[PDB]
Every structure is written in structure tokens, then in C-alpha cells.
Amino acid sequence: AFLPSAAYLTHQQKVLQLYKRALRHLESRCVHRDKYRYFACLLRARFDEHKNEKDMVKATQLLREAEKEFWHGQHPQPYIFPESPGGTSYERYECYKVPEWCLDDWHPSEKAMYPDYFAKREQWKKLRRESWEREVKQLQEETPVGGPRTEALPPARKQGDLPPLWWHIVTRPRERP
Amino acid sequence: MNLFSSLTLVTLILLTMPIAAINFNTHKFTNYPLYVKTTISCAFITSMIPTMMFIHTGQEMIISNWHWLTIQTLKLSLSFKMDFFSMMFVPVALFVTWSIMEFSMWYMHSDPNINQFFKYLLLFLITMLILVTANNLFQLFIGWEGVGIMSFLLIGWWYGRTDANTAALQAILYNRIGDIGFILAMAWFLINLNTWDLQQIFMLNPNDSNLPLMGLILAATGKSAQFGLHPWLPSAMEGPTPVSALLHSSTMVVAGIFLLIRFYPLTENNKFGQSIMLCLGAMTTLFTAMCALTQNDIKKIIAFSTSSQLGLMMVTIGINQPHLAFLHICTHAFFKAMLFMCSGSIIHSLNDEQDIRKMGGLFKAMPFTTTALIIGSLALTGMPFLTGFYSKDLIIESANTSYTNAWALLMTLVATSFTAIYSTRIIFFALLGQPRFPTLININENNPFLINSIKRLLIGSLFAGFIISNNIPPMTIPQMTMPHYLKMTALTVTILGFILALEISNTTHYLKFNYPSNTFKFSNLLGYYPTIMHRLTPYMNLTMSQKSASSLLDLIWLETILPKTISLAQMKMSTTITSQKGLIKLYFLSFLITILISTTLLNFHE
Amino acid sequence: MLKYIIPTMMLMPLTWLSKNSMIWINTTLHSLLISLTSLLLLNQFGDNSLNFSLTFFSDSLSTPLLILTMWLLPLMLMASQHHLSKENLARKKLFISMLILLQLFLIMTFTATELIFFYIMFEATLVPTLIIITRWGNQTERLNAGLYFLFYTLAGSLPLLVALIYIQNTMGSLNFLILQYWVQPMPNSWSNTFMWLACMMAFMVKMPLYGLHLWLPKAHVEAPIAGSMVLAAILLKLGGYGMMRITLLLNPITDFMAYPFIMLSLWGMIMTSSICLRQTDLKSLIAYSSVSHMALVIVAILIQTPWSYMGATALMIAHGLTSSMLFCLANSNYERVHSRTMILARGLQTLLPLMAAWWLLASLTNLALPPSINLIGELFVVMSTFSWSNITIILMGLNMVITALYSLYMLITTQRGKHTHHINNILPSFTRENALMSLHMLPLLLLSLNPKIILGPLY
Amino acid sequence: DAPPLTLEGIKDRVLYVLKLYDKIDPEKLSVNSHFMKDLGLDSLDQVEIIMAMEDEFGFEIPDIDAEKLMCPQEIVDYIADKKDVYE
Amino acid sequence: SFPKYEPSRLASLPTTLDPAEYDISSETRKAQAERLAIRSRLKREYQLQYNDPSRRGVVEDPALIRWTCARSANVYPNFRPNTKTSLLGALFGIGPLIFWYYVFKTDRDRKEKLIQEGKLDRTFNISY
Amino acid sequence: SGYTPDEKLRLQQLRELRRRWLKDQELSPREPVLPPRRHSIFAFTHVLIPVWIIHYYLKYHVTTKPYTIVEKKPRIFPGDTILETGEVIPPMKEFPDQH
Amino acid sequence: ITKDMLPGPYPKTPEERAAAAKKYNMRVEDYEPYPDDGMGYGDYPKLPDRSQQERDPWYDWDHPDLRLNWGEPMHWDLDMYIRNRVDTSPTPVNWNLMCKHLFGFVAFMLFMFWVGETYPTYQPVGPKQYPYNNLYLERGGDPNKEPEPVVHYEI
Numbered sequence A: 001a002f003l004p005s006a007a008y009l010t011h012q013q014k015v016l017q018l019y020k021r022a023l024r025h026l027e028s029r030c031v032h033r034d035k036y037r038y039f040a041c042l043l044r045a046r047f048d049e050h051k052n053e054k055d056m057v058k059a060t061q062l063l064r065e066a067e068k069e070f071w072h073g074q075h076p077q078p079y080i081f082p083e084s085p086g087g088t089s090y091e092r093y094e095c096y097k098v099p100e101w102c103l104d105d106w107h108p109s110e111k112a113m114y115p116d117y118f119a120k121r122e123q124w125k126k127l128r129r130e131s132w133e134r135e136v137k138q139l140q141e142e143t144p145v146g147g148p149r150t151e152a153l154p155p156a157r158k159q160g161d162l163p164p165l166w167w168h169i170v171t172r173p174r175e176r177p
Numbered sequence B: 001m002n003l004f005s006s007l008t009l010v011t012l013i014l015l016t017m018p019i020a021a022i023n024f025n026t027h028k029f030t031n032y033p034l035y036v037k038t039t040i041s042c043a044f045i046t047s048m049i050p051t052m053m054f055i056h057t058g059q060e061m062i063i064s065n066w067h068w069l070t071i072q073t074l075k076l077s078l079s080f081k082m083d084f085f086s087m088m089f090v091p092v093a094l095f096v097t098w099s100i101m102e103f104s105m106w107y108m109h110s111d112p113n114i115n116q117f118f119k120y121l122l123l124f125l126i127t128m129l130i131l132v133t134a135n136n137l138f139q140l141f142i143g144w145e146g147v148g149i150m151s152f153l154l155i156g157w158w159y160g161r162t163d164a165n166t167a168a169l170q171a172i173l174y175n176r177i178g179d180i181g182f183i184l185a186m187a188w189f190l191i192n193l194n195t196w197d198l199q200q201i202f203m204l205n206p207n208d209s210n211l212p213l214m215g216l217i218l219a220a221t222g223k224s225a226q227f228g229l230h231p232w233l234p235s236a237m238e239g240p241t242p243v244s245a246l247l248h249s250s251t252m253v254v255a256g257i258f259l260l261i262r263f264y265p266l267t268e269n270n271k272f273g274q275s276i277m278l279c280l281g282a283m284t285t286l287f288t289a290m291c292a293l294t295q296n297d298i299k300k301i302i303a304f305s306t307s308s309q310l311g312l313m314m315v316t317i318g319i320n321q322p323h324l325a326f327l328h329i330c331t332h333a334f335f336k337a338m339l340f341m342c343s344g345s346i347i348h349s350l351n352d353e354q355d356i357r358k359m360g361g362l363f364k365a366m367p368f369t370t371t372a373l374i375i376g377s378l379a380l381t382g383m384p385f386l387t388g389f390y391s392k393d394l395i396i397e398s399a400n401t402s403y404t405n406a407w408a409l410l411m412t413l414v415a416t417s418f419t420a421i422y423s424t425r426i427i428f429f430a431l432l433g434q435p436r437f438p439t440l441i442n443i444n445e446n447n448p449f450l451i452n453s454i455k456r457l458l459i460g461s462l463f464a465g466f467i468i469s470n471n472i473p474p475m476t477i478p479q480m481t482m483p484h485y486l487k488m489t490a491l492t493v494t495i496l497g498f499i500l501a502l503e504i505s506n507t508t509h510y511l512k513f514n515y516p517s518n519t520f521k522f523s524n525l526l527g528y529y530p531t532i533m534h535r536l537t538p539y540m541n542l543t544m545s546q547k548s549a550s551s552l553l554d555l556i557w558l559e560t561i562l563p564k565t566i567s568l569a570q571m572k573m574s575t576t577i578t579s580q581k582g583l584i585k586l587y588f589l590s591f592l593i594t595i596l597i598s599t600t601l602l603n604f605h606e
Numbered sequence C: 001m002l003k004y005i006i007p008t009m010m011l012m013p014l015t016w017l018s019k020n021s022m023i024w025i026n027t028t029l030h031s032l033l034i035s036l037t038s039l040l041l042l043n044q045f046g047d048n049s050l051n052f053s054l055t056f057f058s059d060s061l062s063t064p065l066l067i068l069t070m071w072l073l074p075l076m077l078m079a080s081q082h083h084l085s086k087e088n089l090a091r092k093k094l095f096i097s098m099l100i101l102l103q104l105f106l107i108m109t110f111t112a113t114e115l116i117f118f119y120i121m122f123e124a125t126l127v128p129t130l131i132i133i134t135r136w137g138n139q140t141e142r143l144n145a146g147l148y149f150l151f152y153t154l155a156g157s158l159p160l161l162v163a164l165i166y167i168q169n170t171m172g173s174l175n176f177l178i179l180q181y182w183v184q185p186m187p188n189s190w191s192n193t194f195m196w197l198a199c200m201m202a203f204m205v206k207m208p209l210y211g212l213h214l215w216l217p218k219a220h221v222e223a224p225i226a227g228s229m230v231l232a233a234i235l236l237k238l239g240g241y242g243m244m245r246i247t248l249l250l251n252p253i254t255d256f257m258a259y260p261f262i263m264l265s266l267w268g269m270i271m272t273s274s275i276c277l278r279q280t281d282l283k284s285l286i287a288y289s290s291v292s293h294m295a296l297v298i299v300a301i302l303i304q305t306p307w308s309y310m311g312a313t314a315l316m317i318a319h320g321l322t323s324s325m326l327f328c329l330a331n332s333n334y335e336r337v338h339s340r341t342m343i344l345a346r347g348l349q350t351l352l353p354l355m356a357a358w359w360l361l362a363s364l365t366n367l368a369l370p371p372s373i374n375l376i377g378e379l380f381v382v383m384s385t386f387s388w389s390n391i392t393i394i395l396m397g398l399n400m401v402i403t404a405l406y407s408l409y410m411l412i413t414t415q416r417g418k419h420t421h422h423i424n425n426i427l428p429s430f431t432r433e434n435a436l437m438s439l440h441m442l443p444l445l446l447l448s449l450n451p452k453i454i455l456g457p458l459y
Numbered sequence D: 001d002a003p004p005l006t007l008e009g010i011k012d013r014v015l016y017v018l019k020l021y022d023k024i025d026p027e028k029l030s031v032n033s034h035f036m037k038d039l040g041l042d043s044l045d046q047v048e049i050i051m052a053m054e055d056e057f058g059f060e061i062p063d064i065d066a067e068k069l070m071c072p073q074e075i076v077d078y079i080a081d082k083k084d085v086y087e
Numbered sequence E: 001s002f003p004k005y006e007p008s009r010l011a012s013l014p015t016t017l018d019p020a021e022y023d024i025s026s027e028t029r030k031a032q033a034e035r036l037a038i039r040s041r042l043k044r045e046y047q048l049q050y051n052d053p054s055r056r057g058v059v060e061d062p063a064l065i066r067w068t069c070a071r072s073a074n075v076y077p078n079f080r081p082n083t084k085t086s087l088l089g090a091l092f093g094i095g096p097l098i099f100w101y102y103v104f105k106t107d108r109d110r111k112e113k114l115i116q117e118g119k120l121d122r123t124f125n126i127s128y
Numbered sequence F: 001s002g003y004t005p006d007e008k009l010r011l012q013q014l015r016e017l018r019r020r021w022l023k024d025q026e027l028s029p030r031e032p033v034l035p036p037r038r039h040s041i042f043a044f045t046h047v048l049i050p051v052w053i054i055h056y057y058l059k060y061h062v063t064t065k066p067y068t069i070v071e072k073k074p075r076i077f078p079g080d081t082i083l084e085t086g087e088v089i090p091p092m093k094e095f096p097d098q099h
Numbered sequence G: 001i002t003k004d005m006l007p008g009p010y011p012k013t014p015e016e017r018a019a020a021a022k023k024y025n026m027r028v029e030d031y032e033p034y035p036d037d038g039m040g041y042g043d044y045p046k047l048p049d050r051s052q053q054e055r056d057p058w059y060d061w062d063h064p065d066l067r068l069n070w071g072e073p074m075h076w077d078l079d080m081y082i083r084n085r086v087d088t089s090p091t092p093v094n095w096n097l098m099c100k101h102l103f104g105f106v107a108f109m110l111f112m113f114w115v116g117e118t119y120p121t122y123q124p125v126g127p128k129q130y131p132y133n134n135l136y137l138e139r140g141g142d143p144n145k146e147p148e149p150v151v152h153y154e155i
């Protein structure tokens, strides 16, 4: 479907995703632990019965009828984790995730309350502006002609330099700011 | 007289002081929530004195202190009304919000904007006390819009969350349809009776009062979340737990019932409005209880529960028992707020988990909240001689022995059984059994704030129904002669619901699997009402907004008719005029033709 | 009225003889002094108007509009001095001069006792605004906006000149004090039908009416901030003042000649609010909201009842203040992010909290939160239209629901949600922007304490 | 509320959960033992392991990151990155 | 069997019930590779403009400008008056105006006729 | 399968930088460097003073104007005694007892 | 920006269609403009009309709240298909079945309310009796007239 590094989903990936969704929905229908354990073992036996099938069209039809079976017997509202999308506390703390570039607009009167922190911030910014040209030069010669094929980034090959495009995924805000 | 009005107005001024205290502050306030809590406790005492005066003598007054405006004949003044309803509701609301703010001191302790949260809570309380003490319809509308706006600001407290914004906007939309109803009623009263003050409305007493009553019924449907405009109340669970526990449980959502209570001289002479209210209330209570039967979120269960209780309030309004309806408001506030507080305690102890499928084994792990939850569910279901017994059984007894719609009574009884069913469903899935929560256990309830607030609301839910029902004066004739089966209807129905849901839970415990039915999907998915309406009506409205108004009319056709056609006509005429070939022979031929036309065809030489 | 005209024309040598850095300080200071001086017009009587001279008078309708104009001028001086920072000094003085000249024409317009002098000033107001829009506007289509605005106004207003001269020749005078006592019934004929159309279409265009509103989302959008403020706050109310003054001569033919425009303006506000629901531009959304509110004022004037007139003048003043504040807030966002798209810069409450509070207050007054004077005007118009007919309550309730919807959609889109990742030039709010917001907000909130001074001449 | 986490506690808890699995001999697994090769497990065993660790720590690991969690050290590093520990 | 999921305008078909999802033919693989290449190239452009330490402003998105220009400033150049446009304009432009005109005219005629006979109760009406 | 070696190397280096950045977010013991900046007064400042002001306002400015504080007349039962007139309201009739 | 990146009129030849597909950053085979009926769309692509809720929530979007990518072609009704507005996600029940079930429930409840209004419940009692001519003077009747005497006897 929508993948950063791959253009498609393999057959085994589809089977594993179906297995996880079916087990989660069966846990939702079977709220007690022992009952869920019993029916999870039954579902695991059903999945292991057709594990060794070499016919591609037959495995595809088995997957399609399994997806139809899951859609007929899904929970009207399954159990979603609190931080998972669709959860009760999903994206709750996004109002407190202030980006780090707002510290450059602070008044010097309130910058004096944290001298050592702002010194460390200054040396971090010095490191970033020193490494930017090296990392973009590394990225320029590693992309094949015609643009990149996937969205994966390369690491730093030699010693001393940081991986390319590292700033906004290292300085991201914490989960609980 | 000089103590009554002084103490009422100083209660209101005492409540409004901390808003000015926080607005004129420079440094960080030293424990501002404690200051607000102390202020509310003092205001509760100060408002508790005039209710003792009213209980002793019956002293009701009206204070029209500040003259505001005079629009020809109509005169608007800052008028407050101390009557039975205001004195019986203000201390209950102040008590409940005192407990809620102590619970908020425990609950929102780690929030970096706790001062803004307490300011918003105090603003909501100020607007609600403006609502319940209002005399004319303008001040009532001010309180109406104030509690609506505070609900919008408090539901979307975590404004970085999209679902909070959707819930807040949806609540605003339904309350604005209620505002349509309120505006229609106020307009009818001004046009036909030439007043907005309630005294002249009650004095003139119109007979053909169908239209303002339907306006008020629509407004109460919007505000109290009756059928048709219900789903904003269960959608409003996106906010913090104290916001729910105050507004969407005990104080804000009873404003429509209160508005219909205040106009009881108008509705007492109209059988049509009474039948409409009875049918709407029965529909609301049964539909919301049926939806509550198969929910898994605990806060959604309690939201559907309080919507069902509001439907019961609309029923007992519709059977011409408005004082019983007010008694049920004052009863229901205590145990509904404390049920929400205990649910919030369970949520906080299990790392923000609101699912009852990930609970259990909390009977001995959290004993105080377990005790309070059991007491609250028993008081909600109608256990004898608790707080709910003194209002709910009288409602059922009056509904049985009255000239009533048969179907409305039937769905009222079935909804009572369903309330019993979901109460014991909550108790079973949240306390009994084996633990289902994650492995690491940080269960704690040893905070003085949470314990003290739950304790105060527990004492209230134990004795307040008895005290209030023994202190109020008799404003009607209580029906106390009935057959044996009609006297035991409420208790037998609740017992039957308890037995049915105990058997349902026992069958759930078995090692069998069954595919879901259409009834289960109808009850679990809220009767397909939000999934159809919230996908269909916004689609039609927004497509009509863009494809018809924004593009077809003013970007295409209103631009076509007046300016563009005129511009093209002038362009074409200009290109025809200036396309001469610059030959003198053609110009002089045109001169000859002009002379001939003027001489012969136009007769300019006559 | 010469005690306000003469300091206004003396503002011109003040801005043309100041230093290179002291033009804003001097002009703002002395305009604020004249704005304080403008409170002496509140000497109104319950029976007679305040008649100064043969040419000038000021009753209780023109007084709030005058005070609004003279208070609005220093706000535009404070607002327009950031985007004119790098401009040439002579062009800066020319901009301030056009603002001064527009204020002079506006204060001579509301006090004109003669109707032809009112017409002359009311069409003299066209030139400074057209020059401001087409010169200091930022976009390509400011020229097209100026052409549309100019030609809509002139095509609407030339028959008004012809009809006013006809009234002068037939009745003998255009003095408004004379015409109150010398008025005659206007019978039903085709001649009087076209008299009504000629006398009404200029102010129907300027207000604007639905269907004649096509110039507004252009002139309100391609103008600079000061131009947008003076277009939304004052210039739309010239049409309202004109219909309030001119309806006296058009009776009893108004009672059936007002039907098509009542249907145009009752249905028009639903269409414009629905347009507001699906707008990708913030400035265009504010302009269409202005169209809806002026449609409300059109209906109130056309049904001609006392409650409708009081609601109309209160709603005019309230919408002027609210629209000016909303345009100022949108301009501050535009200065921060250099784009007018509503979906681009999101989640600004985490970065600009007090500006978010100002946004919330402006949105709350936009949807008529009681007891603001917005709600007072809207409520009085609703009562009078209910007295007119009962299904008007259905139309008004639908309009109120959509108005709350788009105001909160504005607020939730711009201020709430997750912030834009790649935008990192969100500077903290200046003291100038906050002072501008508070000077828009505090009079609006204070007027709820004494709302009797904005309720027209028949309070 | 919300007690903090460390790499030692994360590793101890993840090894506890993996030790309670009946299909893994507890005297053989370590912090960097592979699943398909060093322990002889199927892909379904990996899926059930990932679901068990999700239930243990109370947060959901997406599938596009779950397919690549192949030894206990990568599970520890993924949880440490997602919960921002050692700050 | 099981009841087949019928899609609607407001309830799309799920991606796990689509028969075209399970296609393994090389044309669809080539199409998916081309789409991934376009997406990765655009993401590389955005992240190059995004992580620049010397940039302080707005990374301009031509897609958003394209969307706003299409929504606003293209409708009249790409408008041709035909049967469909004129029919929809007459339905949505003069339809509701005529309908509301006749409704309000009928109501006001009935009220004004009832008033002049003294059949309408106007006892306390002195506000208008 | 698992990560590629390049994915593993990039993840390792990014995790090291992330942990260093998160460590650098801690506070020094001297931070923040703050600049150098009647038991029952609540029952007096918040109750007694507003009660004085409100009683003054109601006594000398609200009760002066007519029909500002309209109070319901007291409920009168048989057997009572009026303060102002001194009269005694007669008791009601004899009861025809049934119980 | 330039005038060759902005939208244009409806493409007729495959050459301008390919140029437009390259302009909007999409494949030529997947690029479908709106039909040329004169509504005013131009060559803007017709994207599959799905809400942003149907997007993958675990993908690293450039705009995470909108689930939108930088440079990607933006839908014509994107401000309508945001997560704050109209949803098009699949439902556990078929749409027609939910419509018929809800409508049948509402209609049945209304019919039974009407039936219960037709045949109400009551108690085996007579009318309530009030003294003093059914409280004639207390109900607001004027005292200068005299009403018809309402007399209640014992039983």
C-alpha cells in the first residue's frame, strides 16, 4: 500500500498482517485471558494448516477468502491502544511539542537563566552548520541518476561526519514534554 | 430581607473575584487552584444561608438592581430571582464543583496550564449561576451562550488533538440548533406578550401558546441532548475527566430541563406540549440505554447513562411533575459526578486506559473507589433509601398512576431495566474477575485530594436525597394510593435487569464463540445515527457550499450576467467603430448617406 | 462641524512638515487627540437633533459613525506603518495624506444636511480608496479590483444623482430638515417605481446587495491593511446611512417595492455564509462574512420598523469594529508567513498564545456572543423580521448556525492543531500588534456597558 | 504516575517475557540471539512475540517496524527510541 | 456465504477486499515502482530544503499554490455556457429566490388580510 | 528479514546522536538562575469587605428606587398574630375526625 | 513560480496531457482530468475522492495532521476531506442496511407513539373535585357575575 522503502507488500507480509489483525480482533471478542488463549491456539492451528502450500493461485485465493472471513467477523469497535491512532490519548501532547527553533527568539534576559544549556545549544548549532555541506556532498554523489528509487537515506561512510539529514530527527521533541 | 439579598449578591461577587485576581496578576500565582477551591467553599457556605432562610419561611425575592436599557416600552434590568429552584440548585452546584476542583487539583497536577484550566472551570460556574438565577430571557440567553462557549473551550482542552476539535465543534452545532429554538421562543414572547421578564409572562398567561412551547422544547432538546440532537453528549468525552464530571454530568446538561422547569405555568395548561415532551423523553431514555448496553469505553457508558437520566427527567416533566423533575436533578448531580470521579481515578491508575476490557481485579486493589462506585451504581439504579430512591421511584409511581401514553410508560420501564443492566455490567467488568491490565503496576489512590472529594460526594450520595426531600415544601399532591403491582414496578424491574445482566456476564465467561448479530451491531454502533448523519449532512452542506454557491453562482454566473457581458459588448462595439480603412472617399460617401437619410427618412428640414 | 474639519485639514501640514522619522508619531498623536475631541457630539436631545449650521447637522444616527471614523484613523496609522517601512518618504507622506483626506470626506459625509452635498462627499470618497488600493496593494489584480469597485459604484450612483436633482426640482429643497416636514406620499406608478430604483440602487451596490457584491472579495482582498480596514469599517456603512436618510421620501411605495431585495438578501446571507464555509483564503472569508452581515442590515432597513432601525445601526457599528479587528489579525499572519492561504500556517496557539486569545475574542464577537453589541443588533433585527413574517426565524436560525460554524472553522484551522513543520520564521508578537488588537477590542467590550449611545435616533 | 524507564529495566523485562515463552529454551537465549536462525522460530512466532511485547509495554509497534525486530537488542533499541529514555 | 460488502459514496471499499490489490503482474509492479520513485524524489527535494541550517522562512509548496489558483482563478477561463451550466444556474440561482418570494408573499397577504378584519389577536402587541 | 547493514549503521548513528541530544537537555544544579526578586485575611478581604460594600449599595441605592427588591409577602396561617396591626387571625373550624 | 506551473485548460492531445501529468507530478497513466462539461475545473487532476482518514497513520508524512506530502497533487476538495470533516472510511455494516435499519426503527417508534396516544392508560377514578364552584374566583373569574353552581355530593 503506502510504504517508504518498498513499492509493494509481499504475500508473506499480507499473511502476517492478517494474522495480527485477526488475533487482535479475536482478543477483542474474547475479553478473558484463558478464553482468548484457547481461541488463539485454534486460530494458530488454522493458520498452520495451510502453511505449506506451493500453489500461488491457491494461496492467493486462501488469502482472499481469509480476508472476507475476517471482514464478516470483525469487532464493531476493537481494542485500540491509548497512544495508537484512533486511541483516546492519540496526539494528545501535540499542543506541548514546541519546536526547538523557538529558542532563538528568546530575550537575552530570560536566556541568562540557563547559561550552560544555551552554551550547549550553541555548540550543537555549530556542529550542525559545520556538517551540513559535507552531508549534502555525500548525498549528492550517492543518489543514482534519475532520482532516488526509495526513501531510505545512507549512513555516514567515513569517520568524523554525521549521517545526512539528521537534525530534525535527532532534535525532535520528547513524547512527554 | 437585608441579609437575604446581601448574601446572594455577595455569593455571586465572591465567585467572580478570582477571575479579576488572575487577570491582574504579574508573577506566578502561589497555589492559585487552592485559592479558587477556598473561594468556592466560602461561596457555598454564603449561598447556603439564604436557602436556610427560604426553608424556614418560604421567602422568595426578586432583585432588579441595575437598570441596563430601555427599548421603547421594553425595559431590561439586571434582575436576579431567588425562588425555590435557585436556592435548591445553587448550593448543590457549588458543592459538586468544590469536589470537582479538589479532584482537579489531584488529576491535572502535571498539566503546565493548570491555572487556565481552573479559570475556565470558574468561568463555566459563573455563567451557569447567571443562567439559573436569571429573571428575563436576555440574561437567560447570556448564561445559555456562556455555558455553550465554555463547553467548547473545555472539550477541546488538548487543542493539538483533532478529535477534540471535532467534538467541540459538533457540540457547538447542536447547541446552536437549540439556540434557534430559544430565539424563536423569545421572539414570540416579545411580539405577542410585550415582555421578556418572566413575571409578566406568567401574569398574562396565553392560551394559544403552542409555538413558544415548541421553541422551548427544541432548545431543551439541543441543550439536554434529547433524541435527534443527542450524539454531542457522548462525543464530548474527549475532554479531561473533571470537565466531563462537572459539565456533561451534573451542571451544564441539565440546563434544558431547568429551562422547561422554569416555564411550568405555561406547560401545565397545554396537553400537546406535555405529550410531545413525554414522547421525546421516553424515546431518549430507551434509545440511549440500549446504546449503553454494549459499550466498552467507561466514560462513554457514563455519558449514555446521564443522557438516559435526562430522558427520564423529560418524561417526568411530560407527566406534569416538574418539582419531581427538579428533585431528580438535585439527586442525580451527586452520584453522577462521583461516578465520573471514580472512573477518572481508575483511568489515572492504569496509565490513561479507558477500556473496561483492560480492567478487572480492582475490588481489592483500590478499595475506596470500589466502595464509592458500588454505592453510586446502587444509588443510580434506585436502591431503597439511598439518594436516588427519593426521586426516581416517585417519578415511576407518578408515571404509572396517571393519564399517560402507554408506549412512553413501557419504554420508561424497559429503560429502567437497562440502567440496572449496564450498571452491573460496569461493576462486573471493572472490578470483578482477574486482572487484564498491563504487567507493571503503579496502582495508587493515596492522595488526600482525591479521597476527600470522593468522600464528600459519597456522603452527599448517601444522605442528600433524604435531607432535600424532607426539607422542600409540598408544591403538589403526592399520589400514594395505588395497587400492589404498580408500587413494586420499579424495584421488580431493576431486580430483573440485575438478574438478566448477571446471567449475561456468566454466559460471557464461558468458552464459546458466536458471530455477532444485527442487534449487537445496532446497539454497539450507536444505532447508526452518527455514522449516517455526520457523514451525510456535512457532505451535502459542503458540496452545496462549493459546487453551487462558491463556484457556479458567484464565480461563474453572477460574474457572467452583469460585468462580463457588458464588457464584451463594449469591446465588440469599439472594434466595429474603430475599424475604418482611412479613405476619404468612404467618409464622404457616409456623409452623403447621412444627408440623404436626414432629409428624406427623418424629415429634419420640416 | 468646523471644529473637527479644521484639525483634520491641519493634519496635512503636520505630516508634510515633520521629520523623516517622526511622521508616524506626530500623525498618530494628533489624530488620537482629535478622536478624544470627537466625544462632544454626544449632546443629543430626545426631541431635536444637534443642528449646527445651514450645511451641517448631526443626529443620533450619524454620531456613532463619526466617532467610529475619527477613532479608526489612528488605528490605520498604527497598522499601515510596518509594510511601508522601506518606502520612499514622499510616498509615505502621500499615503498618510490620502488617509487624512479620506477621513475629512467621511466626516463631511455623515453631517451633510443637504442631500446633494451628501452625494458629492459620498462619491468624493471613491478617489482616495481607489488610489490606495491600486497603488499600495501587493498583487497583480489590484488594478482589476479597482476597476470593478469604481465602475460598480459609479454605475449604481449616476441614477441617484439624476433622481436627487429631480427631487430638488419637484419639491424645491434637498435640505433634510425641510424634507421631514414637506414630505409627500409617493403613489404607485412606473415613474415612481424607477424613482425608487434610482434612489436605492447606489446604496444597494455600496452596502452590498447579494448579486451586486462581486466587487467586494476583490477590493477587500487586494487592498493594503489600512485600505481593508477603512473599506470594511466605514465605507460599507455609507450605503446604510443613505438608505436610512432616503427612505423618508419613498413612502408608501417601499412596502411592495422592497420584496425582491428582501428575498435577495434573506437568501443571500445563506449563500455567502456557505461560501465562507469553503474558503481557502482568509481575507476572502472575512470579506464574505462582511457581505452576510450587510445583507442583515439591508433587510433591517427595508422592513422599516423602530426595532429594525436600532438593530441596524448597532449591527453596523459592531460589524465595523469586528471586521477591522479580523482584517488586522489576518494581516499580522500575512506579515509572518507571506501568504494568505488558510491551510498553510496552522497551530499558531503553541507559538503565539496572546494572539490566539485575540483571535478567540474576535471570533466570539463575530458569532454574536451576548451581551456584545453584535448580539444586540442581530437580536433586534431578528425580532423585527419575526414581526414581519414568521419563516424569517427559520432563515435567521440557519444563518446563525452557519455563522458560528465558519467563525469556529476559522479559529480551529488557524490557531489549533499541529503546527507547520517547515515554517520557522514565526516571530513573537510585537507590542504594536498587541496594542492594535487591544484598541480594537476594549471599546467593543466597553460599549456593552452603555449600549444606548449606538442605538440610532429613535432609541 | 508514569515511572521512568532505563535500558537495564527494558532489557530485563523483555528477557523476562521472552523467557516465559515455552518455545524458547531459557538457558540458550541472550540479548542478541536471532529468531529464525539462532532459535529456530517461524514468522508467526515472531508476530506472536511482537504482540506479547506490545502487551507487556502497553504501546503498539507498527507492522512496518515489527517485521524488522529480529533479536532482543533491536526490540530494546526500538522501545528506547520510541519512549526517549536516557535523557 | 458471507454478505458481500457493497461500497457507497460515503463508505469506500476496504483495501483488503479489493480484487486489484492482489495483482502480481509486472505492469502493476512497474507502476508501483514509478510512483515510489516520484514520491521519493519529491521527498528528497523537500528534505533538502527542510534541513538547511541557513534557511529561515517558508519552504514554498508549488502544489498548494497550484491548488489555490485552480480553486480561485481558473473557474471563469475554463467555463463554457452550455445546457448543463445554464440549467444548474437557473435551478440554484432563481429557484430558491422565487420559492421564498412566493412563501413570504402568501404569508404576509394572509396576515394583512386577517389584521384588517380584526380576526388576528393583537392585544398586547405594541412592539414592532 | 531484518534491517540492511546500511539501515543498521544509520539507525545506530542516529540513536547515538539522539541520546547525546537528550542527555544535553538536562538541567545544571545552578539553573534556573533566578533574579533577586493575618491568618484569617480571606474571611476579611473576600467576605467582609464585599459584604459591607454590597450592603451599602443595596441599602442606600437599590432600596431607594421603587420596585427594585420585590419580595413575596409572608405566608399567613390561622392562629398567627400580625406584628404591625397586632390583630389575631382566628383559628379554623372544628375537624370532623376520621382517624 | 511561473505561468507554466499553474493549472490550465482541458488537454485535448496526448502531448499536452503528458505535459500536464508531468506538471502535477503524477504518472501519465494515472492522470485523469475532470470531464470537459464547462464547470470550470480545467486540467486539474481527478484524484480518487477519499478522505484523509483513510491514509496510513503510521507513515511519516511531511504534514502529519493532514496526512499530506510535500509536492504531492492536492485534491480538489481537500479542505472538505480533512480529519475534522467528512469521513469516507469503510464501515462494519453495509451503508444501505444501516439506513434501512435506522429508518425502520424511527418509523416504528413514531407509529407506536401514535398508537399509544390513541389508546392511553389511566386509573379507575372519577374527576378530581374542587370546592367553591370548582374554584371559580381563584381561577380568575370576575366576582361581579355569578357562575353556574358546581355541586359535589358525597359517596
Ligand SMILES: CCCCCCCCCCCCCCCCCC(=O)OC[C@H](COP(=O)([O-])OCC[N+](C)(C)C)OC(=O)CCCCCCCCCCCCCCCCC
Binding pocket: B065, B066, B067, B068, B069, B076, B077, B078, B079, B136, B138, B139, C371, C448, C449, F053, F056, F057, F061
Ligand atoms: C475596585 C475598587 C473600586 C472602588 C471601591 C470603593 C467604592 C465601592 C463602591 C461603594 C458604593 C458606591 C455607591 C453605590 C454604587 C453606585 C450606585 C448608583 O447609583 O449606581 C448608578 C447606577 C445604578 O442604576 P440606575 O438605575 O441608577 O441607573 C442606570 C443607568 N441608566 C439609567 C443610564 C441606564 O449604575 C450602577 O450601579 C452601575 C454598576 C452596576 C453593577 C453591575 C454591572 C454589571 C455589568 C454587566 C454588563 C452586561 C449586562 C447584560 C445584561 C443586562 C440585563 C439584561
Ligand SMILES: CCCCCCCCCCCCCCCCCC(=O)OC[C@H](COP(=O)([O-])OCC[N+](C)(C)C)OC(=O)CCCCCCCCCCCCCCCCC
Binding pocket: B566, C152, C155, C156, C159, C162, C163, C166, C191, C192, C194, C195, C197, C198, C201, C205
Ligand atoms: C450597478 C448596476 C445597476 C444600476 C441600476 C441603477 C438603477 C436602475 C434604474 C435607473 C433608471 C434611470 C434613472 C431614473 C430616474 C428617475 C427619476 C424620475 O423622476 O423618474 C420619474 C420619471 C417620470 O418622467 P417625468 O417625471 O419627467 O414626468 C412627470 C411625471 N409623469 C410621467 C406623471 C408625467 O421617469 C422617467 O423619466 C423615466 C424613468 C425610467 C428610465 C428608464 C431608462 C433607464 C433604464 C435603466 C438603466 C440602468 C443603468 C444601466 C447601465 C448599467 C451599467 C452599464
Ligand SMILES: CCCCCCCCCCCCCCCCCC(=O)OC[C@H](COP(=O)(O)OCCN)OC(=O)CCCCCCCCCCCCCCCCC
Binding pocket: B163, B166, B167, B169, B170, B171, B173, B177, B180, B217, B218, B221, B227, B228, B229, B280, B530, B533, B534, B535, B537, B538, B541, B542, C394, C397, C398, C401, C405, G083, G084, G085, G086, G087
Ligand atoms: C425535537 C425536534 C428534534 C429534531 C431532530 C431532527 C432535526 C435535526 C437533525 C440533525 C441535524 C444535525 C446533525 C447532522 C450534522 C452533524 C454535523 C457534525 O457535527 O458532525 C460531526 C462530525 C465529526 O464527528 P464524527 O464524524 O462523529 O467523528 C468521529 C471521529 N472522526 O463533524 C463534521 O463532520 C464537521 C462538519 C462541519 C460542517 C457541517 C455542515 C452541516 C451543518 C448542518 C446544519 C443544519 C441546520 C438546520 C437548521 C434548521 C432550522 C429550521
